[model samples]
Target chain A: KPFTLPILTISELTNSRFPIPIEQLYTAPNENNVVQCQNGRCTLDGELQGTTQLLSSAVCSYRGRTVANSGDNWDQNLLQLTYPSGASYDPTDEVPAPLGTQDFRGILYGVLTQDNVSEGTGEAKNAKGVYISTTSGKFTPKIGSIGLHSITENVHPNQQSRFTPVGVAQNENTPFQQWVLPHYAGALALNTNLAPAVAPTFPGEQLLFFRSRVPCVQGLRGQDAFIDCLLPQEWVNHFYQEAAPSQADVALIRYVNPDTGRTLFEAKLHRSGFITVSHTGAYPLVVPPNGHFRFDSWVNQFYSLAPM
Target chain B: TKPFTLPILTISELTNSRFPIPIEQLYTAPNENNVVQCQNGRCTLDGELQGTTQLLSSAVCSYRGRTVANSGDNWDQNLLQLTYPSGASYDPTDEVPAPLGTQDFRGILYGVLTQDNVSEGTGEAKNAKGVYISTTSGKFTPKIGSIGLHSITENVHPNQQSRFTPVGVAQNENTPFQQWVLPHYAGALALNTNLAPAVAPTFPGEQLLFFRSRVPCVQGLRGQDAFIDCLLPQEWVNHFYQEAAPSQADVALIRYVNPDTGRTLFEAKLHRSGFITVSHTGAYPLVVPPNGHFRFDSWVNQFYSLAPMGT
Candidate 1:
């Protein structure tokens, strides 16, 4: 049937001082609990993963600005989690790696790049003393909350596939609730708006939205998938306000499976833009265990069925 | 019907980008039982407390979590909440600064800093009894926007906004005429040109509508298909709508019955796996005339174009 597109699930990550233990990773089950975690973290014990200060002090990197000893470093969380994908793994030396598993979801895990680097005496890199050189973009997660796909639409100017049944229905074709989405093919690919200038996976891409022309048109593949979306970009982007031009609204999919290419659903055909900001203001980010989320639908092939 | 308050203002320029808060020596009378008394140098009203009208303004500013008495006990001034259509209620010690219009004093200090009681200078200080609410920081969740696969079409020229400014239509003065779109939720639910005879909102027999429809709705790592900046691209609906055809319902006719008001215009039961097919209902396709007056196969003739601004 391939039409149910709702799936969030990040589970947890709190950390300002405490609350980081999302049961280690996420199993769900506890009576019917939801999920919650937020607080960006800049450091100084704000804990993005200060991981006991610095896994017990030993490395180098910071973007809020410091730059001391230089040291020979390599830990942007391991650039967050690399992304080459023909096949590669380095849970810091693999063998059954993938930290907590689901194959680490899509890797490129969390807190990609925060930017802060000053105290180093042992070894660093960038001029070589080892490596660890940071430029100070002073960021901490920057802003990347994601999740959306509820549904509400009534269409009839020329219909084919329609959705808007659950909730307030008089009888427009009842039967609602089914929106599937969740994948990471190499964490999609990484790279975008990168620190100082660019480079980290640079243009991997992920973010596709749908509900068009109405009907059972089908094409979102499943059954051990990876990713495969294609087309839909530039909703709107006048100029520059608070930094948003990573391809404007943004949507770019491209991942398949064939026999087991196993990349999943990243096939490509996604592009988006528009941030007058108001779908509720931010976004769920992730859910999956009775989080009680809903937004319904909203279609706009740019104002159709017009008269204005 | 003419009384105002919520006047406390004294920022004096800290770091300066555009700071200006005199607002008439900080008055008070808007209601909610006004009260303001801070320490350091100014922000008074608590029992009048001193002379020279009690100086009031050193800069520690706090009024909800309590801490305005001065010296270092710290509190520059907080107490605020004001609204006045005539309903009353204004605090921050009375109110009288009128600098731009409706009793303006920076709009009563931003209506007492959008009260819930006030403190919003940073974060966790206005929730246990203090107030200033409005910070969800994630909006309402679900973050996928502008997806694609859209295209709609209705008569054509639905109304063209009279002179321009289209995309679903809009006419001013009082609707003038021509306004269509019925699919509600996630968008579409417009047909009220002030409603003299508009009437539309009636769709029974299996319905489901969700949106994030077209115009760069999330498709671009090289997928590009964005449209809908505004005004007219043929008014949009994917420029004219197409693609619709996949409904049978027996042979078409599940119960409708209208004949001229004998009654019963809807009834259905056929679930083709949960019906799915779109593109202006796959392009017009639903035809089963025969007699008229009334007959129903349960809609699926196919046709699409919803618009309530959720494109």
Candidate 2:
């Protein structure tokens, strides 16, 4: 038998604003509650798909630089998954497209980090984008927060213009409304009640939506998947917002398969390493067919892609 | 009750070349009335007995290359540089620096000059030798001469300095020499003058025995010949005067025994350095036995024994 190595996983959460029990965030997804959408829009009975399926969750933390038991973090709040095999996604006009045989034309799916900080932008809530391949059995999911966030903005046009909501939508003519109405197809809606204290300043609620799949196309593939929303620094400095001002440690990221109860991937994040500056730590993605979701800060996240 | 820690006698009396070069040549020339006589112990060319210890031999030293086998089988060829406890040294390049106060730093010293290989002015190749003392040990490379043998033999055992008792050395033929020779006399006195009575001698020439046995397999390599040389455990048993059959067995015997079947496959003594096989075959061709699998028992004569099973 091969040696069993240790793994660490980290999912960004908070105890302050919209504090949701971290336990419910790790529940498995219901296969029967799978959603189906078309175009760059998706809806079920005229309502946005709000199923919270567990993608990967485990109780782990950062290990001390020298000691094993001494942790480098505030607490045992991270779960790490290890991807022995690597995973990747490519959404572009180039050959060997991210969707394999198909263009970037498919529903984009993935996780998003909550807007722990109140924002003045009338765009409701600032959501980090995570996309996936519509052709099941094709592109597997990897560990860490993945989707179309600021990190992949330069990689594809779909992420920069297509599915990305405008900064603010004061009227129906605003770019946010124009883009959201047809592209998101009402798959994404405003939940004003879930907004933080900064919600009353804007007419729209701090919008937060998670779906298994939303009909999307080629260039939009760049919005497919992202691992961590809080960069190493952001996670260390703001996620917890220490009261006494203390030094911090590394974070663990884990992606687990709820059905088989097996860990898929794990990684350690350094505020100075690939997650923050280099941006080159790519892990293998193997999203299960039944879909996966997480619970935290009262915002539910899900990923439902069929096996191709 | 001191351990058998007797110091070895230097073999200088058997061979010396310190008289005037021409006169020394005259005494050793083919046929001459140069028979030297001794009185108390000293002798001279006039054949008159003296009142002091001296050397008397008509044999002249030859410059021609002599047989390598004339060097004892256990003859080593490296120089062990040691130091006095004061940190001062007997030589310029002492390998083992002094440890503390006023005791002699101990280790194995090799290399000896022979009649055939000694050069007048240049460094010469000499026979190797080793001595045993009951002190702690240290490390040193051959500072002055070549070591005759390669590859270590006894890894399980400590080192040569630790394996002082039961020391028996034999020579092998390398050139004009063939037969194995033992040190017959301590000084140049007479034949077998240092022989011990009844029990085995504390020094050399007790009761040398050999056994033709099988060589075991090596761990990472391959080996298992039909016949291999071995030394009988009787030598140590005789030296310590221990008659117990079970306790008489050395570490090798204890380890060689198969605990499950109650049988001993074979047993061979090991040297301290774990190299330079001092076995009957003159080399350690077998691999070291696995640890903890076999039980290593007690011993006598500073050597261990083997047995069929744990008794």
Candidate 3:
């Protein structure tokens, strides 16, 4: 295989016989059949049973075959479906987009939206009709600040990510936010990799910042993955223990294609702790060969490597 | 027949192991007279390196082990539960876990943990701490919290003597990410974090020429991730034509000597990264006989300068 499974544990991350091979194609099933999913059924690491309200503007159609497994290193955030009318679109289902304006729509993955109406009373089921979209702050490509806002519900069960954001609700910040800015500023001073010179594939390309579940391996996410973020420091804080008060985390900077469900570039930001803040960069993924890893133009052709 | 059980890390293994197993054999100095006795939780270093109120921090402080803001404890006290080592006695709450090689002890841990972490009288300061005889007394390595080192008898085995090897262990499938690496000198912090390079191959002539020093591997050496933190000229050197200058500051000064004849052989400085394939390897010098012994620990902190001046 060209890549190992998405790295979640330090053991997988530090596999000795390997710089463990990994890949990220930013792809997911486009099938949008109104999945009438049943309850209490799913293989491990599989398509979690739920109907995620497609947040993009052009939604409501068939996505493709089976919905991809959650955390499968595929972009299952946006809705991609083909209607019977011979048209394909990932609709911005929630109008006046949750981050405030239509200019900035929602891009969520995993069990993003589910009904909060369950206890020991009945068997839990996926949210059938309700649609929810709440991103941290308004995402603007040329913007510089990030809102460490409170949330109504946690986003995903991503292992080791700094922010398992619940929902975008304006509220008093937690005591943990006190350390957020400090760690963030610390990350900025010690930023890994420089921006690549590749142009955005689509206009109105948006940047989505989130506490990444998977460590962004160097040459996989962006169009120009020429070299990894080859700073002398360990790129990912491989040593993480929740029992400890504070530890390192992998933050992700995803560049989403505005109208559709595609990512143009992604960068991994190594933080001193589970941090949150803003960044300033174009596309820092393109880098010349350092001592070990070297990438070229053909790297952009990597979309998805189906099981062989 | 009577049943047999695997050793459970105690004094009974003393005949086979060379390190501080069973905790009773843990000593500060090479001599048994300097044994570091411990009971319950407190340890009493009744002998060796007990400089007045100077030494006695648990292990690697601030460097890798970080403390939380207002975590109800400080760095020094984390290492010191009650009194100072003015006479060498106390329990330690702070601990740099096991699996670190003696190299890390002499390199990073020995440099900080045992040295700093204490204040002197009125603010004068003690000059030195009780030194961990990593080379002699051995290091802590066995389990999650146990240090990694060998007993003198076990380390100096006939095979190691013939192979000119040091006390070490190879990583296994169950090794933690922190200790994951190829066969390496034991007790390193983790992958590529060995504090010092391996001791040179045992050849009779030109021994002290390779004086042990600080700053052996600065992390990014080849195979460092796989435990080849340091290398001998025969294992990696003598690549003047194939290698290139890694960083301008990255070079090693070496002097090879003929083993049996006790005469000097050709010696030259070579690029450390060994990868300058994109450019020229002409920066430093190279070449050696298969059996010759060489010297030069590290050029990290330069004692000799390099220049090609035009008059």
Candidate 4:
């Protein structure tokens, strides 16, 4: 006898690794003809049960046969039905009218990579995935070709920057405003590649300003506005405690996209702190080359009001 | 008001319409220790007038005292407490904090209290009252009731409370002038209403600077005597290429070297934001050389000139 080849169904290909083909993915189920529903008490006496009704109806309709749930051996009847459409039937009664495309809106905190893979180069540190639901709406990433975003051009004389040389405690107590016009009025570009004239995409949906109240421990409420404000003294203290144990000065670095109002990267660095962070790989729909990011940093000074 | 008795009889009595005497005088001599002889509005010594003028030197005096002759005419009192070496202190209300320590001082001494809050002197007659010194000091002691020359809010390390850096100064404060001992170094009253009032009559008048100076950053210069031009050169000198970026008068990083060894004394990078550890880094101020030979530095290529008063 000749060797026989086993026939593989299209439905088997819709495993964890690959996208479901259009034909095998979606197909509405057929309505039942006989009213076997007794006061909503479905029985499998040559009749489909509530649970098995959808699959029975789908298979029976595809094969031009009746949905008969022969109580003990309903699986046998289900096996006799036609496949492809009959493979996994979601009941017709369960389907809504005008079956619109399914819509999903939620928060996903993790690096988005090319080919939908989570990890690789250009991914955030700790690459752990977390889902959080909040009152805040999710903002879509402002997709763009990979390039450098000039932070210097985005920085203006910060009339609204809340940064003070004095610590937060003193700044809060002082009624009048005491501001310093920083010596350096320019900014730098933050991207994977520092190549000039390349427009880049920002990753952060919002800037989270953190201030630690104690050493190595930050308060839960330390998060603040994303606007023109200085990092609190506690935040600086936290940076020193974490980044540079022996050094006195610490810097808070941020890679912000001025166009989309998003922060792409952030880190607490010690004196003269510099780091290189890459952006996540683009989706298959839009594949872009790697670029660079830079920081727009500001250092503050506290003069001695109490003479030393 | 008693013909507005000038601070000193020697210099004020010679005042004419061309030279009005209100507060102070600067008498230049042939040498640092010589007495100045004034004739026909020009000063002279053993040499002919303006001949061998390289030795010409000048001293400033207010009604209170001449620049205290110690440590080459340096300001010796604690800036925060305003007390001199003799422990003579002046705080009207005893509200201000105590002196941190004696300072490297020099500048003007008031021979008389022309201004009320400047000193406790009674009459316009020459009295030891207000004094101004130009040198790095522990802290400034502006009379609590009188105007403070300048107020600096220092940064104290969280772990090291004893260590503090004068990180910033008030915009209009004369503290920088007093501390740096720049040209005109006359102490000014605190005009800001936010500050406390003075104890004695204050010098209610306009103030100005005479000589302007600049210098290049040398690698191995240190101490209160460090000169920018005299120090060795560093490779970072090429970093300041932008013309508009670097200011002419601002001081850059200094490589402090000891007199004994050619080794660098204490090397450090002091940022414009002013994060400096005192013990680790020796951040020195620019110095004004005697006579007219002020050296120059160029974070930028520009040079500033300082002139004697009524030049």
Error of 2 at A110 (Å): 67
Scored by lDDT, model 4 comes in at: 0.18
Each candidate's B-chain TM-score, in sequence, is 0.13, 0.20, 0.21, 0.18
**How would you class the docking of model 1?**
incorrect
Tens-digit per-residue lDDT, A93-188, candidate 4: 232100110011111111100111111221111111112111111111111001111111111121111000101111111111111111110113
**Better model by TM-score: candidate 2 vs candidate 4:** 4
The candidate 1 chain B region of ten consecutive residues with least summed lDDT is B99-108
Q: Residue by residue across A1-308, what tens digits does model 3's lDDT show?
A: 11111212111111110111112112211133211111111111222111111111111111211122244222222222222111232333321111111111232111122222222222111111111122332221112122211112222221111111111111122111100111111222321111211112222331211111111111112222111111101112112101122122233434343345444444332222111112223322321111112111121212221121
**A-chain TM-score of every model:** 0.18, 0.19, 0.18, 0.13
lDDT of 3 by residue, B143-201 (tens): 12222221111111111101001112222222221211222222343332212222221
Candidate 2 stretches greater than 4 Å from native: A1-308, B1-180, B184-188, B195-255, B258-288, B292-311
- Model 4 reaches an interface RMSD of 39.8
Worst lDDT window (10 residues) for model 2 chain B? B19-28
- Give one digit per residue, the lDDT tens place, for model 1 in A184-235: 1223333221111111121222122211111110111111112111111111
- Where is model 4 more than 4 Å wrong at Cα? A1-204, A207-308, B1-311
Q: Write the per-residue lDDT of candidate 2 for residues B1-311, one digit (tens) a residue.
A: 22221011111101111110110000101112211111111222112212211111111110111112213333332222222211123332322111111111121211112111112122111111122211111112111111122111211111221101111111112111111111211112223221111111122211212222221111111121212121212112111221122222212222344445665444433221110011231122333222212223323344332221111
Estimate every model's Cα lDDT from 0 to 1.
Answer: 0.16, 0.19, 0.20, 0.18
Worst 10 residues of 3 chain B by lDDT: B156-165
lDDT by residue (B170-233, candidate 4, tens digit) is 1112222132222211134232121111111111211111111111101111122111110101
Cα distance off (Å), candidate 1, residue B25: 69
